[PDB]
Design a protein around this ligand. Structure first.
Ligand SMILES: [Cl-]
Ligand SMILES: [Cl-]
Ligand code: NA
Ligand code: NA
Lengths: 544, 543, 544
């Protein structure tokens, strides 16, 4: 038969207590007056001199009656002002033992804790702002990501990160651009008292309903940025970071989210980016690969110029597409939603977005607002224009006259009602003539078969000057053209306007085709000066 | 020291006397039970304190398991009710800022107000054998407080049932109170409930939840998954996302419902099948787009519509309802999308696959398959059963249909284009007498306002209004251009009845007046009602 | 006040221990020398003869001091080489008691354990590769899915599956293609030592941050396949399986993911498919319904021919669309991303993809690379071509001359600059003429109203032979046509080229309209031989 040896109230009373093999004792709390970290202990004479402070304490082996490793069982004193060394022993023990770590009371740390690989740490606190919290009492990262991949694989479940002094510290920081790789942030809250929510090189990390800056334990006057992932081009780039139902509120730095090194695949599913006060943009990134917003909100950012601003050199890499798929955007920014610093890229898709604008939709690298050349598609969008808002030629539900996209190429199309006046159209300007001189207008060729015999119709509108206006001398010519080898065939079907050259400014010309298949215009009568032609082709001929 | 002893109930602990530091083991909160048990240390400073959970006449709960359980708050498994125990549990867990765990199935006849920051979880089985909470009265299991007082919560793996089918609900709002910033992780909603959730949801995500698959007791009145009623302007149901959720066997007027122009309700890979709703699957007075990104909408043969939008478009509206890659095997009986407002919402069907016993959309005026409501229709496959119809909407098996109503591009290269009404204008009711002149269209430069225009016009004039078999017809080819007040028109050619041999012949000579109007003058005996159709080319447009 | 009776060190010491009603004992571990499976026990004389091995042991009732059911409390011996019978009792106990099961130490099994319905089993191990593991010491499935729906409803949280011998065993297998239905795989890791990660018929299963084949405990030379779900057509189909942020690396079988029976709705949100060595494709499936990739990576698979290859008979079912929405694709395969076995289907959408190609974009069932007829849409894509890469006529950001899609039909459209030369175009070949003979070219009719009076202009380009080339005899004709009942009206507005028939090879013709509304050409002069016509219509007339 075996009886209970006794009960102890602290770890100091356990190490000084002597026993024999098989004896079991009850410890009520790691420290006196506490109930946390307590556990049953069985004595082992083989390890009587072993005392690591957690599992074995001078022969007393932890029995894990609760089946869970807690930070209190590693020396975390709730009455103490600091728990840094206790947390370090907790991460080292939980990872070396290959078991999850549980934070059972709010910790306060003044020294960083390096993130050991495969760390799974969870909190048993309340919901959202009353979750199990870890506060940084100094201007130091709560966790330090190791260099290279030494911190790869981790799990952070329902933990809150605060700072004792507003505008200091961060939850994570990387040494030598170390990778915070293959991690999960489940319902983690990042208090606005932090200077940076996450200042580590993130890769392959998913965020499940995290919160950045909604709640604020102490006032932050320096600034708050949600994420800053800085890496190295080619070897350590911030990649594959997805956000589900996350919230980004009350930012005060130059941007809320930032990453460089042409990091790839940052996407936001049903996220909420509102009530920020960023000075430049909500997302400032030197990135490649597309960036997509699948549902969510981008609103209430009246003082932020841009929603997203891409940087870098397009020769090295670029974002091809930024898609806003069904985003509620009630005043998302103040200047333009998408700001480009490279030419042409990125393109934008606004699919079913809804809200009111005090800004432009996009801005090119040269400052052109609402550049349709940057609009890959714009369908089913509803935008009301407030003071400062503009859409330009971009199509909306209330502005059907705009364009859905810049260009589309199809191999076939059936359009019932088509409106296109510059169809097979070519413009040639600065056609300077003297009396009776000849000037080439365009080159004729078969549009499908190279070097083949062409044949079609030409509508030429010649005017005096460069661009037509009210009272501009005009003339129209209808020409049938075709070729058989060196033989050129042109027939003027008709004409109208000032076609006789009664004055120098009259666009009067006779048409021919030379040996180079060039449509040549010869001045008629007194015609002389600078003219401009516009050719509209039909059939098996093109004017280039 | 030594262990003081073992007790079998809470009443045995409070009647037990002790001194400071003494530790006792309680085996269960009530006699004959092994739940709610914990170690207790005596504290003479709190000898008169007895809240029933943490301190019991000086005995402080030691949390040997490290978790707060509803059984440790007075929940008696042998008792028929646990209402007062649950209220004390949520109040204790929230005030202590720690998670609450439901360790056995609860039965409640009085509501429990949702305290803020409540994290409550269950340790039961999977799906239908999860930790369950049954309402033994027609009352909400949880009551959301008014305003934002219930904001922040977490519900993990909890099933909600009703002792009587067709009664009670898991959640209800006081004065349209906000159920804000919550998460429903693998929560099951039994069909015995009258409503799965009858609260004003906002900023809530649903992770693999189930609505109405399982049924504990027969419900003859009806089951609705979600009904969120709010207040316009101040409390609107917004930002509610559903991932991999299941909605089966609904029997009310709809399965999902929200009003007040609530925004951003999206469904990722959800399953809406086997329902028996009388009106629609989703009946909502909503604004902002609504999206279905993957999933199923099928087996709803008795449900008229899949989604039906309501409200006034002047206040707000849904701009787009996108069905992105949805498997739709008989999703409804009349039309997938039913509109109450004109024009809005537009619809996108991207890669959908299934069989139709209904139309695709129905406008506010009842027009089935109104292509004006189709923002895009690409890569869809729909098999037509009895009652199914697609109209002019394009499918993989019906390429003759249209992908969309309209698209505007600044540039385009189309290899093979089919467009006969290109730069086309029709003018009817052109009544002529012998030699009279009637304007047909206004000419202008199509890109530069007021500039000199110049191009060609193809005019097809007919007798009457609309062409038919044997209709007198005539075609004219005209070159036009202008220089200030000077108008230049040249008839390149003509064909047909162009001489006016009879009154019904569409014979006209063409001119341009000072108002830049293309004027037709009757030729010969031409008199009566005629109609023209103009096709322009070049720097001229007929308006 | 009753005192604690004593302390026990094993389950065998409890069953041999006698007691009276109400007495409580403490067991330190289920087996001697162990601290797991321990719990408090209270004696019940009514159940003195009951001994199920977990809850009641010869009258001693388990008190659940920790409040959690563990596999160690069901007979799992850490010192034993096998835990199969203990695991089987654990699933039977946890499901019959309707409470979650916890694996507190790594298990090793040589016999399968059938999946009881509603099983919720979790692990308390580390993160990712150091998670709580279950190893199969034989060529057997770790879990066996029951036939039909008998295993429906389950939850697997943070568990890892390994094999003692590389290339053997699997985590799941189905009896009679039984349904692994309504399950969740949360952060589960599948070691590459397995022959198959999952070889069961999956349906209504979601995968949350799972890993397939990144880590390899022991060397696998036979092969590793991530998922293979084989079902029955009509009755047992693998449906409704969604993957969020999952990783698929280093496959060595014929494919990485496989399912048949025209299973529906397999989607991949922000998944990672890279560094595989698959022999045929990454995804080989006989599937129906669309397949979508919303963000993620498909790269570094230089030895894999295809990314996805659909099979089956389109009469039974087919995939209508395979969408790659914003996918990073740096060398995703070696021949073609999409391989079709059926005609026409599936269609492909590449929306904002970014990467480098050593392959084609698609390959049809007849082997045609980059068949534009299979491209439903291709917008904002950036693809750099390496050796073996090709896009054909598919449009990219750097190759704007390509097509975004094969065809689009709109009821209305406003295009500022339209380039379309085969507009309202018809070609008729093999027009064989003798001296003065007549041959029909096309049928004329109203394009909107059936049988109504048509009226418009026709541009006809007649050539000698069939297809135009350099030096081909050509002639152009401009015709105004209209009809009034049996009366046909045609007027040659003009002509150009070899229109007089001076030689036999000249395309010289006179145009008329017969009673069948056919545009008839009559040879002029000496014209005789093989000719071809191309007609371009305008107005209320069409040439068919
Ligand atoms: Cl499109
Ligand atoms: Cl079993
Ligand atoms: Na990567
Ligand atoms: Na007509």
């Amino acid at each position: 038969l075996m009886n209970l040896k006794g009960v102890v109230n602290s770890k100091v009373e356990l190490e000084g207590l002597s026993g024999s093999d098989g004896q079991v004792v009850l410890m009520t709390g790691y420290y006196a007056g506490q109930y946390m970290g307590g556990d049953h202990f069985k004595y082992d004479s083989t390890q009587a001199l072993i005392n690591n402070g957690v599992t074995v304490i001078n022969g007393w082996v932890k029995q894990f009656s609760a089946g869970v490793l807690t930070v209190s069982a590693c020396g975390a004193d709730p009455s103490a002002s600091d728990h840094s060394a206790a947390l370090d022993l907790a991460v080292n023990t939980a990872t070396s033992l290959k078991r999850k770590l549980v934070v059972d009371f709010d910790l306060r740390v003044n020294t960083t804790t390096e993130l050991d690989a495969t760390l799974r740490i969870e909190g048993d606190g309340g919901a959202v702002q009353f979750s199990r919290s870890i506060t940084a009492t100094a201007d130091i990262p709560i966790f330090t990501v190791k260099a290279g991949f030494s911190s790869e694989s981790s799990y952070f479940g329902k933990l809150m990160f605060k700072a004792s002094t507003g505008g200091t510290a961060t939850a994570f920081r990387s040494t030598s651009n170390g990778y915070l790789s293959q991690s999960t942030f489940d319902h983690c809250v990042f208090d606005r008292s932090l200077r940076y929510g996450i200042d580590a090189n993130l890769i392959l990390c998913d965020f499940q309903k995290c919160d950045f800056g909604t709640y604020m334990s102490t006032t932050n006057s320096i600034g708050f940025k949600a994420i800053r992932s800085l890496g190295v081009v080619g070897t350590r780039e911030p990649n594959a970071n997805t956000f589900y139902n996350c919230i980004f509120r009350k930012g005060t730095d130059d941007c809320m989210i930032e990453w460089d090194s042409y990091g790839t695949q940052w996407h936001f599913f049903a996220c909420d980016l509102e009530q920020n006060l960023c000075t430049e943009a909500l997302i400032k990134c030197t990135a490649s690969s597309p960036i997509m917003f699948v549902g969510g909100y981008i609103e209430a950012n009246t003082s932020t110029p841009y929603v997203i601003k891409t940087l870098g050199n397009s020769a090295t890499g670029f974002v091809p597409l930024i898609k806003f798929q069904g985003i509620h955007m009630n005043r998302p920014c103040s200047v333009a939603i998408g700001k480009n610093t490279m030419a042409n890229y990125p393109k934008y898709i606004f699919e079913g977005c809804y809200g009111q604008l005090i800004s432009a939709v996009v801005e090119s690298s040269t400052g052109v607002l609402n550049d349709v050349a940057l609009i890959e598609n714009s369908i089913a969008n509803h935008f009301t224009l407030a003071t400062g808002g503009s859409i330009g030629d971009i199509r909306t539900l209330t502005m059907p006259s705009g364009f859905n996209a810049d260009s589309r190429n199809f191999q076939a199309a059936k359009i019932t009602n088509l409106t296109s006046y510059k169809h097979n159209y070519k413009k040639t300007i600065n056609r300077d003539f003297t009396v009776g001189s000849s000037v080439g207008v365009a080159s004729l060729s078969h549009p499908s078969i190279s070097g083949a015999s062409y044949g079609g119709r030409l509508l030429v509108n010649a005017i005096f000057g460069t661009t037509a206006a009210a009272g501009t001398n005009s003339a129209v010519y209808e020409l049938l053209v075709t070729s058989v080898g060196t033989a050129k065939y042109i027939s003027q079907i008709g004409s109208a306007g000032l076609t006789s050259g009664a004055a120098a400014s009259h666009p009067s010309f006779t048409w021919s085709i030379n040996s180079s298949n060039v449509l040549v215009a010869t001045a008629v009568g007194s015609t002389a000066g600078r003219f401009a032609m516009e050719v509209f082709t039909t059939g098996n001929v093109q004017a280039t």
